[PDB]
Design a protein around this ligand. Structure first.
Ligand code: HEC
Ligand SMILES: O=C(O)c1cc(C(=O)O)c2c(n1)C(=O)C(=O)c1cc(C(=O)O)[nH]c1-2
Ligand SMILES: [Ca+2]
Length: 684
């Protein structure tokens, strides 16, 4: 047998000769996520059945796109643990736990997720939460090399996305724009992990001369130097695409840090390359072209979203394009060689813009509704921080010419803080520089707000700039898609199931429960001529952690496991045990001032993980259902006693009295829970 995971440039480029394999996160460099396999089709997909499953170690967000090469599957679970499984029956071959430094677990904004690995010449590459990029021997399961990609240990840098390997170089970015960091993309040698090059996405100290054409161009679009301490943002924490013929690596750049443009860049400048699509030479990393989807990004509008390279008929002529549906709500068709904007259309309502100006390729700002930094109001904006589309991958099907997008219809308030926020030294707290996500505390209000949020699979036609068909979901954060030559599109839903639709009409043809929400993109491969289809299930991520209450509309519990199906499968689906009863809360406090003080601390230090207003999404602990014993050791826990479980220490940020204030607030919220509880039952 050949070396396991023996993938190289030519093998990926020639992926169609091996449709039974999935050797790059998006199967191919164009990341179309379209499988030529058709044993399973719109004619028999109804016979599909679970073949095997594997239980992952932690029940938190599962966002991994499995990689399959010659009988072996390489996937991941929470905290970047890498698994190698026999693709035929799910037998565990080896398990590599990089042991992501839990002391830095709170540096992750959106749950301890990982979107998968990459392979190359017998090695598996994984981006570890704590910021390390590591190579793993495909055969032994032992570490080959490891490098700390963090350019500054004082900044909250993390890695959640899947790396891509180009010309023997492992490409990876990082996350952290919610805490305040300067974004960048690094390329390391696949063999030694020796840094090949590094492309920063936003300028640094404006005093120093710009380094590289990219920065000479970007530096002009920023004013003042307050963004240097803030970080600037522009992290490339997710998607990447690559065109061999043009030798261009396509980088998806994220949002600005801080979010507020007035505090970040004197409310002036486009702030390149924030919320932009950037192309650079795969071998040198030098700038070639770019397209900014959201100039002066002020609403957390990243452009790290999935980019698909394809060829389409535009104006009667074949055009090699790049397609993307970033957070701002536009679907872009761009010439992947020159950066020319070929077309742009909203796939969802957008309150921030009055539409695109095709003469310049720049969107017109709707100040009255979105310029919260200039107007005086708290604007309800849509899309909001989770966009019209987030990380969940989309896919392209050449037999229909449609792009299947897991879209969102959500909104939130964006309010400007009058005084210039001052950077905080604590590394585990959001630092957005503005007020957002405000919502009712009462259950009635939350439910009402949740009804304004919804999701939907959009089968978009990039040429017509129109939706061919659409399928609605009760909430957001539904799974990524997968297209196949069998007139099928697969997708997992937030509400708990795995589905198969007819690619051309959207008719639901197959469906099974998944035991938990399915956010990861589905994958398909073959072994001994038999086609398999696998989903990575596990509710979690940013949605169900931060907006705990709203996400309850999904009615699913966390339960991370690999689920793979095949024609005839009869294996049984394992399900999570019932949620335990909630112990009764301790006596409520008469110190409202203390309660109030605690509420403000909680909002700034605990919401991203335990839920806004203490209402958890059920993935991470709900602080209103603490047992009497946990209440007894509340100080010890807050001060590091639970670090091994990802519960950061707050010993460096709070005084004991402050900890007690939060405690009193949580106990008060626990009593509110009691008053309600039925109102909560009607979320699902
Ligand atoms: C994400 C980085 C977190 C932030 C921010 C806060 N907490 Fe947390 N907390 C987190 C995890 C992953 C866990 C436990 C996971 C497991 O399975 O063990 C916890 C746990 C707690 C607990 C104990 C709950 C229980 O055992 O029932 C408490 C009391 C707690 N956390 C409090 C707390 C407070 C007050 C926070 C804001 C200052 C806070 N947490 C933030 C993850 C994260
Ligand atoms: O600003 C950043 O650096 C950054 C990083 C990440 C991450 O690494 O997961 C997310 C986001 N932003 C983000 O804006 C977002 O909506 C998001 C959702 C998720 C998820 O896993 O569901 N991650 C992230
Ligand atoms: Ca962000």
């Amino acid at each position: 047998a050949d070396i396991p995971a023996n993938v190289d440039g030519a093998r990926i480029i020639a992926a169609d000769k091996e449709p039974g394999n999935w050797m790059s996160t998006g199967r191919t460099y164009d990341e179309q996520r379209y499988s030529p396999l058709k044993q399973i089709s719109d004619q028999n997909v109804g016979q599909l059945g679970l073949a095997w499953s594997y239980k992952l170690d932690l029940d938190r967000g599962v966002e991994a796109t499995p990689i399959v090469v010659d009988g072996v599957m390489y996937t991941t679970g929470p905290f970047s643990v890498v698994y190698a499984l026999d693709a035929r029956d799910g037998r565990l071959i080896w398990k590599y736990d990089p042991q992501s430094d839990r002391h830095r677990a709170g540096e992750a904004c959106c749950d301890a997720v990982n979107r998968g690995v990459a392979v190359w010449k017998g090695k598996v590459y994984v981006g570890v939460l704590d910021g390390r990029l590591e190579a793993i021997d495909a055969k032994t399961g032992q570490r080959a090399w490891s490098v700390d990609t963090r350019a500054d240990h004082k900044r909250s840098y993390t890695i959640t996305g899947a790396p891509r390997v180009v010309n023997g170089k492992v490409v990876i970015g990082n996350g952290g724009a919610e805490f305040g960091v300067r974004g960048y993309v690094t390329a390391y040698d696949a063999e030694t992990g020796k840094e090949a090059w590094r492309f920063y996405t936003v300028p640094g100290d404006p005093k120093l001369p710009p380094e590289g054409k990219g920065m000479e161009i970007a530096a002009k679009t920023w004013f003042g130097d307050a963004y240097v301490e803030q970080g600037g943002g522009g992290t490339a924490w997710d998607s990447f695409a690559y065109d061999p013929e043009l030798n261009l690596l396509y980088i998806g750049v994220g949002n600005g840090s801080l979010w507020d443009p007035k505090w970040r860049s004197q409310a002036k400048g486009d702030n390149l390359f924030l919320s932009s699509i950037v192309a650079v030479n795969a071998d040198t990393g030098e700038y070639v072209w770019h397209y900014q989807t959201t100039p002066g990004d002020a609403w957390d509008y990243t452009a790290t979203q999935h980019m698909i390279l394809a060829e389409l008929p535009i104006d009667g002529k074949p055009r090699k394009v790049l397609m993307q549906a970033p957070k701002n709500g536009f679907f872009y068709v761009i010439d992947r060689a020159t950066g020319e904007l070929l077309s742009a259309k909203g796939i969802v309502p957008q309150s921030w813009t009055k539409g695109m100006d095709m003469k310049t390729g720049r969107p017109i700002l709707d100040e009255e509704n979105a310029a919260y930094w200039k107007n005086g109001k708290r604007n309800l904006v849509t899309p909001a921080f989770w966009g019209a589309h987030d990380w969940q991958p989309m896919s392209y099907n050449p037999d229909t010419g449609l792009v299947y997008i897991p879209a969102h219809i959500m909104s939130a308030y964006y309010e400007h803080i009058p005084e210039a926020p001052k950077r905080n030294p604590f590394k585990s707290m959001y630092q957005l520089g503005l007020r957002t996500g405000m919502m009712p505390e009462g259950a009635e209000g939350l439910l009402e707000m949740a009804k304004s949020w919804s999701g939907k699979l959009i089968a978009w036609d990039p040429v017509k700039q129109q939706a061919a068909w659409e399928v609605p979901y009760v909430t957001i954060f539904n799974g990524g898609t997968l297209s196949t030559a069998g007139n099928l599109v697969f997708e997992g839903s937030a509400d708990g199931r795995v589905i198969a639709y007819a690619a051309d009409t959207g008719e639901k043809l197959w469906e099974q429960p998944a035991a938990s929400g399915v956010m990861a993109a589905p994958v398909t491969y073959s072994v001994d001529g038999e086609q398999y289809v696998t989903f990575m299930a596990g509710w979690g991520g940013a949605f169900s952690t931060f907006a705990g209450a709203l996400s309850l509309r999904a009615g699913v519990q966390p339960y991370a496991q690999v689920l793979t199906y095949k024609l005839g499968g009869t294996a049984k689906l394992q399900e999570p045990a019932p949620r335990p009863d909630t112990p009764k809360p301790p006596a409520l406090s008469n110190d409202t001032a203390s309660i109030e003080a605690g509420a403000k601390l909680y909002d700034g230090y605990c919401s991203q993980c335990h839920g806004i207003h203490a209402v958890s999404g059920g993935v991470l602990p709900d602080l209103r259902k603490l047992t009497p014993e946990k209440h007894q050791m509340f100080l010890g826990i807050l001060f590091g006693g639970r670090v091994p479980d990802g519960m950061p220490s707050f010993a460096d940020a709070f005084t004991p009295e402050q900890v007690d204030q939060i405690h009193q607030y949580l106990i008060k919220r626990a009593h509110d829970l009691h008053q309600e509880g039925d109102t909560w039952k009607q979320f699902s």
